[PDB]
Design goal:
The structure is a homotetramer of 226-residue chains.
Chain A (H helix, E strand, L loop, with lengths): L9 H19 L3 H6 L1 H24 L11 H18 L12 H4 L4 H4 L1 H12 L6 H20 L14 H4 L1 H4 L10 H4 L6 H26 L3
The structure holds the ligand CCCCCCCC/C=C/CCCCCCCC(=O)O[C@@H](COC(=O)CCCCCCCCCCCCCCC)COP(=O)([O-])OCC[N+](C)(C)C (12 copies).
Subcellular location (chains A, B, C, D): Membrane
Protein name (chains A, B, C, D): BH1501 protein
GO molecular function, one term (chains A, B, C, D): voltage-gated sodium channel activity
Chain lengths: 226, 226, 226, 226
Amino acid sequence: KMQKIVNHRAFTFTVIALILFNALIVGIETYPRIYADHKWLFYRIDLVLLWIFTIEIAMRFLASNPKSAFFRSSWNWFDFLIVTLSLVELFLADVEGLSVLRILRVLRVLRAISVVPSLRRLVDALVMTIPALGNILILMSIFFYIFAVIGTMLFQHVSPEYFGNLQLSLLTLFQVVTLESWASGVMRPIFAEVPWSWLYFVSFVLIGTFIIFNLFIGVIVNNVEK
Amino acid sequence: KMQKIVNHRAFTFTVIALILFNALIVGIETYPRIYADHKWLFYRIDLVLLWIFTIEIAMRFLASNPKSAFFRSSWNWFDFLIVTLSLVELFLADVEGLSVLRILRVLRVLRAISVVPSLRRLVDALVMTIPALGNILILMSIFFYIFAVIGTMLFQHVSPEYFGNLQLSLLTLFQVVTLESWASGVMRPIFAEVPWSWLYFVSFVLIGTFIIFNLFIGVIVNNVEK
Amino acid sequence: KMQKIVNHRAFTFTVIALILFNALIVGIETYPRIYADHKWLFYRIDLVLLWIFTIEIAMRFLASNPKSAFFRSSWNWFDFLIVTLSLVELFLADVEGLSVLRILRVLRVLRAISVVPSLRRLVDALVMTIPALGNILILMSIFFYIFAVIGTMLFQHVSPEYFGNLQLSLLTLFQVVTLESWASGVMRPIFAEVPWSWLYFVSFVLIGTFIIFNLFIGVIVNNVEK
Amino acid sequence: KMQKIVNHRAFTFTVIALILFNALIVGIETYPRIYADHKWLFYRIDLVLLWIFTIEIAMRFLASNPKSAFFRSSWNWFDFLIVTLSLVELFLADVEGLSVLRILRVLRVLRAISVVPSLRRLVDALVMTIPALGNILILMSIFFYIFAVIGTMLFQHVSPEYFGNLQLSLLTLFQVVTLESWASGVMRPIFAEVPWSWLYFVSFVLIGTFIIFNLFIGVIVNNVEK
Ligand SMILES: CCCCCCCC/C=C/CCCCCCCC(=O)O[C@@H](COC(=O)CCCCCCCCCCCCCCC)COP(=O)([O-])OCC[N+](C)(C)C
Ligand SMILES: CCCCCCCC/C=C/CCCCCCCC(=O)O[C@@H](COC(=O)CCCCCCCCCCCCCCC)COP(=O)([O-])OCC[N+](C)(C)C
Ligand SMILES: CCCCCCCC/C=C/CCCCCCCC(=O)O[C@@H](COC(=O)CCCCCCCCCCCCCCC)COP(=O)([O-])OCC[N+](C)(C)C
Ligand SMILES: CCCCCCCC/C=C/CCCCCCCC(=O)O[C@@H](COC(=O)CCCCCCCCCCCCCCC)COP(=O)([O-])OCC[N+](C)(C)C
Ligand SMILES: CCCCCCCC/C=C/CCCCCCCC(=O)O[C@@H](COC(=O)CCCCCCCCCCCCCCC)COP(=O)([O-])OCC[N+](C)(C)C
Ligand SMILES: CCCCCCCC/C=C/CCCCCCCC(=O)O[C@@H](COC(=O)CCCCCCCCCCCCCCC)COP(=O)([O-])OCC[N+](C)(C)C
Ligand SMILES: CCCCCCCC/C=C/CCCCCCCC(=O)O[C@@H](COC(=O)CCCCCCCCCCCCCCC)COP(=O)([O-])OCC[N+](C)(C)C
Ligand SMILES: CCCCCCCC/C=C/CCCCCCCC(=O)O[C@@H](COC(=O)CCCCCCCCCCCCCCC)COP(=O)([O-])OCC[N+](C)(C)C
Ligand SMILES: CCCCCCCC/C=C\CCCCCCCC(=O)O[C@@H](COC(=O)CCCCCCCCCCCCCCC)COP(=O)([O-])OCC[N+](C)(C)C
Ligand SMILES: CCCCCCCC/C=C\CCCCCCCC(=O)O[C@@H](COC(=O)CCCCCCCCCCCCCCC)COP(=O)([O-])OCC[N+](C)(C)C
Ligand SMILES: CCCCCCCC/C=C\CCCCCCCC(=O)O[C@@H](COC(=O)CCCCCCCCCCCCCCC)COP(=O)([O-])OCC[N+](C)(C)C
Ligand SMILES: CCCCCCCC/C=C\CCCCCCCC(=O)O[C@@H](COC(=O)CCCCCCCCCCCCCCC)COP(=O)([O-])OCC[N+](C)(C)C
């Protein structure tokens, strides 16, 4: 009565192949003409692929010793979430708010990183180094917030474009920490009006960079040790 | 008569929570309409928060064994400086020179990194690696100064914008070492007139980069060792 | 009857010198006037250099113990491929499709990295670290594909320039991961129309960067170990 | 009769202080008005500083055991070269070709890195890692040359600006390897005409980057070892 043996060689291979085909079709469908000429087929195949993933994860669930740890392990929670999101897409297909709904029709491909064990191990390892660089991110958040607040009150009425709110300015402070056109297009047109403005960026760009550098190093000599 | 026990669990927790609320309100206040509609409340809460921080640091001072090392430790000096700067803001509120005065109303949030011990330890560690990369910064300063002097006499009358003074040119030499639009907007419009100008940037961008790279490495294989 | 001894000191030296001269002439020939004034000489020297390389590699082949491992080693396969490509150039000289044919007249210089042993060892070592960073590249490919698909359906009709197809958009997603004008010229003119668009880039630029950082580290603490 | 003892504490201190003052004055002199109003003083002080450096290095020479190794050590050769260059400036002051002559009036400050021993040791160490990354630079040179040649024949008549010669194009290939506006301003206006052009940059920007990354790593795990 118990479901004892369920696993075999292609038990995954077929799933990953199917996911690849899913990616292929969901990519193709993004062409206006080709999609607009064969819509019934795309409809039917999307439905059937949805149902395959559904019955797949359900098969694993039922044959995963329910009362013991299946929903206890996070990976399967992630799989389940992905399938539920595809279902949300389906059963709430096209009321109106579809623009940010068709998108979820895509991420069903990234469950690839769940099935192939090497990618699973790699991604879990990558996440396991997030609590390593924990504090540094808090420091960087403090830094960003302080500088955003300081900017939005200084340059509010000289550059409404970049420094207009605490939200909008929290953008200009991001595309500057990445050293992206921070001089000729963020500063030179401001530094022209308020001449003492430079002390802002030349400070931020400095200290920000420093922190980032150290953050990077903080990880490097952590894997030499572990 | 002596103040023996003063510490407990929330002895910090309440302070850091209050600081968070301080950040929240000082952020909100940067909206023109919302601040302009409820100013009395913002006034009163700013005053009361100021007084809370004041009585807090004073409590620590009095219950910090005055004659022994309290003002001897630098962190408390930093705290005291921050509180005094907020006070400078208050008692010298709005004579006229307020533009660069309201700013100090902000950095009172960064004393967060003082109170939570993990951030304190991290920041102290980060500073402790400044005397490590001591010389390299002297070398980089020499380099910057030399190249600024060399530029301002060559391109003074062909590009008044970027190379106009030893000060202004010390900017163009900064937004070039960060590889920010150094070619199409700093050089191509100059390289057009003085054709041999390229040897300037292609030298600087080279050597500067080299130094920086080495500086970075100079830190990396210093934490593998310590 | 067997070819026993074939090697000596300059056995390579002459070849690398000749290759250097080949580079020199193939570089010179890219000037319109100078090439257009002495074409017969360039013709004849190109022919003779081709034949020198031909007889060279053929000499090695015949005096490389044919039945045993000569074509078994990959380097010689690469050499042979290069010579055959030069020959393809010659015997299929100028039917019409020459634009992407004259190019192969160039890469015959890079066989330099085959002959000088230090470069050979270095390049082989560099390649030997490709299977090291194997998975991370698969993860990055998945990431790129997902984000390209997600972009091309959102911004298809607001920015036909950058996001027009799954191909063209796979470019805009490349010159953004390199942080090249990703804000002022890829996003600000889009973020103006669809205001919620920022969550796209600020996500990608984030996660992409993270992956890349880790990839880099994944190699660093792999040479400390091997 | 022999010069036995010549060294003492300030034997350097005075020299480095004087060099600092030299930097200060040579910087000041770059202002048009201020220099144009007091020229006699600047003249006389430049002359006297020149003579101080002269007599200084000559003192060291004579009291450096001439027949034994003084000119044998490279640092003193560098010092001597710098002083001779200042002298070239003086005795060949203003015939006409002064534009690239006043410049040498500057680098006399960088002899600072000779006198202060910490900087001397650091700079010598930095140079001692140039023969470490020897081959990689040869590989990068090969790469640059190949791609420059390949570009200048493809895009010669569609973008005369960037790809016009083997020299000029060797610039556009430099401000692209640094990821500086390589997409929106080097490629998009070219990729519009020759549509298959992308395979150029997306290749170069790829492989170049790879090499650079590896070069960096090639140094990192060389100081963990030495
Ligand atoms: C394991 C999970 C990872 C996922 C990896 C991906 C796995 C699955 C990959 C799936 C790829 C998706 C395929 C979609 C292409 C459909 C063909 C097409 O559109 O032709 C179009 C033409 O267009 C052309 O002329 C050229 C078509 C090739 C461009 C495809 C780019 C490659 C994407 C690869 C991305 C690689 C991702 C990595 C990137 C670093 C037709 O439309 P049209 O404009 O009307 O032209 C009319 C032509 N006609 C006259 C003949 C009618
Ligand atoms: C790990 C986390 C680390 C956190 C560290 C983060 C550090 C925070 C970084 C803060 C950056 C500072 C930004 C302020 C500079 C811009 C000001 C400006 O431009 O306005 C005016 C400059 O008016 C002046 O004269 C100011 C001259 C220098 C003031 C320096 C301010 C230092 C603030 C305290 C320093 C505290 C130091 C530290 C304290 C402990 C411009 O002129 P105006 O008056 O507006 O006149 C009208 C405009 N008009 C000119 C067109 C007519
Ligand atoms: C531990 C110390 C670290 C500090 C961390 C921060 C801790 C404290 C954080 C404090 C955050 C500050 C809150 C201020 C927002 C007030 C609400 C508001 O302005 O609404 C405005 C609307 O605006 C909107 O429509 C959207 C509002 C959300 C934008 C807030 C950005 C989040 C900042 C988070 C930064 C994260 C920092 C990290 C970033 C990496 C109302 O103004 P209006 O334009 O007139 O609109 C009219 C609307 N009405 C019709 C209803 C009237
Ligand atoms: C760790 C710290 C390391 C420090 C190292 C830092 C190194 C310092 C780096 C210095 C960079 C050098 C910058 C100078 C190049 C630009 C000059 C120029 O463009 O002007 C002229 C070029 O006129 C020429 O013909 C010059 C040709 C090459 C001269 C090379 C100068 C080397 C100086 C000595 C080298 C010393 C080497 C080292 C010595 C020990 C332009 O033409 P024009 O004459 O003006 O004519 C009028 C304009 N017109 C054309 C429109 C009509
Ligand atoms: C080991 C394998 C690695 C390969 C390494 C390379 C090894 C082999 C290197 C080969 C180099 C190729 C030489 C070609 C130059 C020919 C001379 C010429 O064109 O003169 C032109 C003038 O142009 C000038 O005025 C200046 C010429 C010097 C520019 C050459 C750039 C150096 C390229 C080095 C690249 C270094 C690569 C590294 C870069 C990091 C003449 O044409 P014109 O316009 O009509 O002028 C008329 C003048 N006239 C009046 C006198 C008639
Ligand atoms: C290692 C690999 C890691 C892979 C991770 C990769 C993660 C993937 C990253 C995906 C990035 C997400 C991009 C979507 C954001 C842009 C949407 C947009 O702008 O359209 C609309 C926003 O409409 C809204 O109101 C949306 C508000 C936020 C929605 C957030 C979407 C999250 C999707 C699920 C999150 C799943 C989380 C994870 C699930 C497990 C714009 O407005 P409009 O509706 O079009 O109205 C008409 C236009 N008009 C405004 C001009 C009138
Ligand atoms: C150890 C070796 C390493 C070398 C390190 C350097 C050591 C030696 C450093 C020497 C520094 C050189 C000093 C030159 C300044 C002269 C004063 C001046 O020009 O005033 C001008 C005004 O200009 C101003 O209004 C502000 C002047 C300060 C700008 C100086 C920038 C600091 C350079 C520091 C670079 C730091 C390098 C590091 C950078 C990272 C006057 O000219 P004017 O325009 O006509 O104004 C009229 C005013 N008036 C009405 C009163 C008349
Ligand atoms: C460590 C050192 C490593 C060294 C590695 C360095 C590798 C070297 C990297 C070289 C980069 C390659 C650059 C060439 C691509 C651009 C060509 C182009 O755009 O012209 C044409 C594309 O015409 C085509 O149809 C070409 C289609 C793809 C050809 C691929 C070329 C591969 C060359 C061999 C590959 C060898 C692989 C390796 C061999 C061993 C454009 O069209 P048109 O024909 O001009 O028509 C007229 C213009 N019109 C369109 C406006 C009307
Ligand atoms: C916190 C970082 C600062 C560093 C200080 C270092 C010394 C800083 C030197 C001088 C500082 C003060 C100069 C006096 C001028 C002040 C006001 C002024 O006139 O501004 C003038 C220029 O403003 C500049 O020139 C900014 C200088 C950029 C510094 C880049 C240093 C990079 C450090 C290297 C990092 C690597 C090593 C890192 C080692 C730490 C502009 O105003 P104006 O001339 O009156 O003209 C009117 C305005 N107008 C232009 C719109 C028309
Ligand atoms: C110090 C670094 C230099 C490196 C030298 C290497 C060889 C350098 C090769 C040739 C050097 C000399 C060429 C002769 C031309 C001189 C004058 C000239 O005519 O300029 C011409 C172009 O100027 C250029 O082309 C600059 C070349 C950029 C070099 C990029 C190398 C990157 C090294 C790779 C780094 C990685 C490996 C690093 C390994 C170290 C322009 O003048 P014009 O043509 O007469 O036209 C009139 C002016 N006009 C354009 C405004 C209309
Ligand atoms: C996934 C990453 C997100 C991070 C969230 C963090 C908090 C994010 C805070 C607030 C989030 C939501 C704000 C409410 C506004 C939503 C809609 C909106 O109005 O947009 C508004 C602005 O949009 C922005 O301001 C984007 C904020 C950029 C975030 C940069 C954070 C960098 C993290 C640091 C990385 C280092 C540490 C990393 C630690 C992880 C624009 O719309 P509008 O105002 O209505 O005006 C009409 C549109 N118009 C402009 C075209 C005219
Ligand atoms: C060597 C690197 C290549 C990689 C291949 C990967 C798959 C490449 C996918 C498809 C390749 C071929 C697509 C078919 C189109 C060919 C011709 C064409 O039409 O071009 C079209 C677009 O051209 C592009 O879209 C270029 C795609 C950029 C690739 C970015 C991948 C980054 C790798 C990630 C690095 C990280 C991981 C690294 C893992 C290695 C434009 O031509 P058109 O549409 O006809 O319109 C007319 C021209 N017009 C626009 C001027 C009007």
